[PDB]
Structure formats: structure tokens, C-alpha cells
Amino acid sequence: SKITSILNPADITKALEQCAAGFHHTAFFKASGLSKKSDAELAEIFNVLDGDQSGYIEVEELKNFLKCFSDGARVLNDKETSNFLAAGDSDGDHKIGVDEFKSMAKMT
Ligand SMILES: [Ca+2]
Ligand SMILES: [Ca+2]
């Protein structure tokens, strides 16, 4: 998909392995290559993470973030999910919008 076209599978594997002892978004975004992608590439990624095309990554989607990169990956636990949301959700609506996703990828 766009994921495996935009990102290198080997980088995805690194980022997934890094999750074994706990998910940290900055480490994941670095390993995966997300923090090197352009504005426009990040919007494309956002659209495929937004499974229901709501315009947002809701918390229920965010729990399944790793599965967007590999379907067999684990779910995030509640601590992981809440910290990730907290990092991204600057406008206070408890979901991640396209602008917030770009900002989280490049400026954290
Ligand atoms: Ca959504
Ligand atoms: Ca938000």
C-alpha cells in the first residue's frame, strides 16, 4: 500500500521490534522513517491511518496504530494509547487531526 511505498519495510520492522519493551512515539516515528517524510507524504500516511475516513485518528484507531504497519502487530495498551494521544492532541478534542499528525511527526 502507500505505507510500504512511502516507508521502507525494513524500517517498519525496526520500529515494531522497538515496541517489544514498550511503545514510545518519538522512537517509532524515527525508526519507521515517518519523521523524515514530507508534509504531503505525512498527509497521505494520515489518510491511510484514518481507516473510517472520519478526518481524525480516534483513540480506538490509535490503539491499533501498529497494526496499520503490520496486521499481526500488537495493540497498544491504555498507557501507551493515552501518552500518544497526549503528545499529538494539541487542540483538545481527544483525537488526532491531519495538522496535528504532521506536527507530531516533525517537531517532537
Ligand atoms: Ca478515523
Ligand atoms: Ca485534536
UniProtKB/Swiss-Prot annotation:
Coiled-coil residues are: none
Q: What is this protein called?
A: Parvalbumin alpha
Q: What else is known?
A: This parvalbumin has an isoelectric point of 4.45.
Binding, Ca(2+) 1:
50, 52, 54, 56, 58, 61
Alphabetic keyword roster: Acetylation, Allergen, Calcium, Metal-binding, Muscle protein, Repeat
* Pfam families found in the cross-reference section: EF-hand_7
What are its GO cellular component terms?
A: cytoplasm
Q: Which GO terms describe its molecular function?
A: calcium ion binding
Q: Which family does it belong to?
A: Belongs to the parvalbumin family.
Please describe how the activity of this protein depends on temperature.
Thermostable between pH 4.0-9.5. Average melting temperature (Tm) across all pH values is 68 degrees Celsius.
- Report the source organism: Raja clavata (Thornback ray)
What SMART domains is this protein classified in? Answer: EFh
Binding sites annotated in the UniProt record for Ca(2+) 2: 89, 91, 93, 95, 100
How does this protein assemble? Monomer.
- Show the InterPro entries listed in the entry: EF-hand-dom_pair (IPR011992), EF_Hand_1_Ca_BS (IPR018247), EF_hand_dom (IPR002048), Parvalbumin (IPR008080)
Is Iron set as a keyword in this record?
A: no
